[PDB]
Structure 1
């Protein structure tokens, strides 16, 4: 049991503690770590590789599931309405919450013992990890059920299976549009967006759409964006009293905060009206994840940036320079060359002191150290890894929303009008939302508009 001991025996790979650690004073202690499961257990032939339990496609599998039994259990089978099952005990001001899961060792139950609120059941197992994530999961659940309801009115002869699949098809395209239209340009910047994601031409069945092992670590760049608090705002977008700023170490797996502390509306308002944390070379990641990650459900607070680095080793990932070469980017050998690459010699000196050679810098560490591309939130290396991955997921997807035959021309035209602020408008009590782009907009009331000014998705071309 990797959570209870510091013994380095399978499947454990504990993180060793350095001397003079600011928190863990006992060098015999460790940060818990379970090695990712191998694709070929106990093999003496294979080069160890890890498994992706999910579909690589941007297909909203985090809502629907990536396995047939779970996908069935997430559905409401009591009728022919094609709905996803909702919570049978609680509702958020008359609106649906995710069903509860049935885990033998429920970590949500530990975040507040007296509250007795278990983790939620969704398409992906991490839905309850933070209430901001749960809110996003809940929002997509209500959107599926809202689409299924309107599709039912439009097509009364559609059975449950047809209604579920058609609403599921819509939700997936909505995730694809928001990701590629709004999210990714703000991650990569215009230069890397043009290079790694050129205009979609057509589906190409020779493009491998699998998630690359390195992407599982490189996409953890988002840990640098994490604020140390969960921010909750009322209908006036003012701090919701008495707990408007909850430390993140007290929200991990805290499903009780959604259920018993005001629902998803204060959480969504906080997300839209609070700025993200800027990644700076001297301000990489906050102590809420670096010192106190999962503090309430673990014997010791985890260190997320350290886990990312131990994970890249567990996954046998090449170091910084091998990934630089892969991307056709210069590979610095000296501290002066590293300094030029990072436009920061002081940081280059610290990396050389820790690693000895830039060849050994762990991919997450070197990736997040790089200065950010103009109008982007990653440097050249992460932009190449992330850009390449999202190009393969788009081009190698037969069900990509713009691929011919997936949607009619009229449905594609209707889908181009969708936006995340509209989904918030349609499924919550929030009546004032961010102006497009929602991922840029962050200041109330300057960046905010009333829901009534926003175009709704026109389902007319879904009438059979």
Structure 2
């Protein structure tokens, strides 16, 4: 009874309220928390471990699904066109929307009672979490269908399965290319990129491709990039009235905002032409996530950073120093030493007041506290955990896009030409997109170009 009870009984591990809290004034209340499902339930032999319900590979499983029945249901099986099913009730300016899902306790319906717009159905259960995410999901759904259509005109004798597969294979490589070429270097910075992600050579069958338990927490560094608003922009990259700056605590699960407030174009424009939030040691994460997470679909607004630290404890993750020691980094033991590591004594004092020792600092908290690496957005600890994980996913993937035999030399040269700005051009009404790199480009019109200047993915090498 985690959603409503405050009694600490399995599977509940509620977050207790401290005195003089800025929001929750009743100390008998709590922040709801369900302990993650144990891999081996009831065991008095194994050390509690958690499950990854997804494929560790960067294979667009958020589009296709990580389970066979879900994956069948996501496909359009009415024909041999090899397409993904789309919404049969609504469209975004003639363009496809993700199908609706059949949830028992649908949180999306709670975001706007009168609208009656349910959650979307994607490869991953979190598609409707924020409309910016729904937009990315809707974009890749269109990209698959665009590819399957192009392939049918190229190879008319190819059946639905072959069309589905070949387009899935392209979408997966596109996700890999964007991640490794454009995203990761900006997360890590040049040095951590050379250290953890040296030039790909070939597939190594002795590389464990699994997600480490620590990564589930460490990759939450992204919480420090979250802006308190959802920004929408019109055709001319100008604030879309009414509601151009909707608060984040009014967009969670608001699937209706995609369906009834202009579709994906204003959201994608907002994502491209708005800066991200910068992580600063005195400005870690916004109150829209720290105080009002899921405010309108729950009894109480959650605290995301607190959940991150409680989750790491639920997962039995060692503290800051043990991760520093694992990464080959010095382990500070005093306030002064920690002040040196963080290049900030003020923060070190606050951290010592809470934990008493750097050994006890929860991974997320320690990680996000570290000064950022030159031209990157993480410190040395998270750079190590993150970099280590992504190398394993690359070198341990038999279907890695560059692996000999996965694609042809020609197909590889055609895929090398893809970009996220181009995917936007091909699947939306947007005619002016971010200059490469899309992750750096954030100012309109300085960093923006016409779609005409961008060459398309040439599928010629896919002819049979």
Give the secondary-structure state (helix, strand or coil) at the position aligned to 1:72.
Answer: helix
Distance across 2 between alignment mates of 1:417 and 1:453: 13
Distance across 2 between alignment mates of 1:332 and 1:377: 22
Distance across 2 between alignment mates of 1:266 and 1:92: 11
Distance across 2 between alignment mates of 1:223 and 1:5: 27
Distance across 1 between alignment mates of 2:247 and 2:2: 26
**1:18 Cα deviation (Å)?**
0.4
- Equivalent residue number for residue 101 of structure 1: 101
The count of corresponding residues between Structure 1 and Structure 2 is: 464
- Equivalent residue number for residue 424 of structure 2: 424
**1:455 Cα deviation (Å)?**
1.0
Distance across 1 between alignment mates of 2:125 and 2:450: 34
**Can you list the C-alpha shifts for 1:247-288, whole angstroms capped at 9, x where unaligned?**
000000000000000000000000000000000000000000
**1:387 Cα deviation (Å)?**
0.1
Give the secondary-structure state (helix, strand or coil) at the position aligned to 2:449.
Answer: strand
**1:5 Cα deviation (Å)?**
1.4
Unaligned runs of 5+ in 1: none
Give the secondary-structure state (helix, strand or coil) at the position aligned to 2:360.
Answer: coil
**Can you list the C-alpha shifts for 1:22-51, whole angstroms capped at 9, x where unaligned?**
000011110010000000011111100000
Give the secondary-structure state (helix, strand or coil) at the position aligned to 1:12.
Answer: coil
Distance across 2 between alignment mates of 1:152 and 1:446: 39
Distance across 2 between alignment mates of 1:330 and 1:263: 49
**1:79 Cα deviation (Å)?**
0.3
Distance across 1 between alignment mates of 2:11 and 2:131: 30
**1:4 Cα deviation (Å)?**
1.1
**1:7 Cα deviation (Å)?**
1.2
**Can you list the C-alpha shifts for 1:234-259, whole angstroms capped at 9, x where unaligned?**
00000000100000000000000000
Give the secondary-structure state (helix, strand or coil) at the position aligned to 2:399.
Answer: coil
Give the secondary-structure state (helix, strand or coil) at the position aligned to 1:276.
Answer: strand
Which ranges of 4 or more aligned residues in structure 1 deviate by more than 4 Å? none
Distance across 2 between alignment mates of 1:314 and 1:111: 30
**1:421 Cα deviation (Å)?**
0.1
Distance across 2 between alignment mates of 1:456 and 1:387: 31
Unaligned runs of 5+ in 2: none
**1:154 Cα deviation (Å)?**
0.4
Distance across 1 between alignment mates of 2:99 and 2:7: 37
Distance across 2 between alignment mates of 1:146 and 1:450: 20
1:327-406 matches, within 5 Å, as 327-406=327-406
**1:209 Cα deviation (Å)?**
0.2
Give the secondary-structure state (helix, strand or coil) at the position aligned to 1:359.
Answer: helix
Distance across 2 between alignment mates of 1:12 and 1:156: 55
**1:425 Cα deviation (Å)?**
0.3
Give the secondary-structure state (helix, strand or coil) at the position aligned to 1:91.
Answer: coil
**Can you list the C-alpha shifts for 1:124-174, whole angstroms capped at 9, x where unaligned?**
000000000000000000000000000000000000000000000000000
Distance across 2 between alignment mates of 1:408 and 1:23: 58
Distance across 2 between alignment mates of 1:75 and 1:41: 34
1:41-440 matches, within 5 Å, as 41-440=41-440
**Can you list the C-alpha shifts for 1:163-214, whole angstroms capped at 9, x where unaligned?**
0000000000000000000000000000000000000000000000000000
**Can you list the C-alpha shifts for 1:400-447, whole angstroms capped at 9, x where unaligned?**
000000000000000000000000000000000000000000000000
Distance across 2 between alignment mates of 1:61 and 1:79: 23
**1:316 Cα deviation (Å)?**
0.2
Using structure 2 for the length normalisation, give the TM-score.
1.00
Give the secondary-structure state (helix, strand or coil) at the position aligned to 1:95.
Answer: coil
**Can you list the C-alpha shifts for 1:86-123, whole angstroms capped at 9, x where unaligned?**
00000000000000000000000000010000000000
Distance across 1 between alignment mates of 2:52 and 2:377: 26
**1:377 Cα deviation (Å)?**
0.1
Give the secondary-structure state (helix, strand or coil) at the position aligned to 2:295.
Answer: coil
**1:10 Cα deviation (Å)?**
1.0
Distance across 2 between alignment mates of 1:174 and 1:391: 17
Give the secondary-structure state (helix, strand or coil) at the position aligned to 2:296.
Answer: coil
Give the secondary-structure state (helix, strand or coil) at the position aligned to 1:449.
Answer: strand
**1:323 Cα deviation (Å)?**
0.2
Distance across 2 between alignment mates of 1:455 and 1:3: 50
Distance across 2 between alignment mates of 1:158 and 1:358: 60
Distance across 2 between alignment mates of 1:203 and 1:145: 30
Give the secondary-structure state (helix, strand or coil) at the position aligned to 2:4.
Answer: coil
Give the secondary-structure state (helix, strand or coil) at the position aligned to 2:12.
Answer: coil
Distance across 2 between alignment mates of 1:140 and 1:12: 36
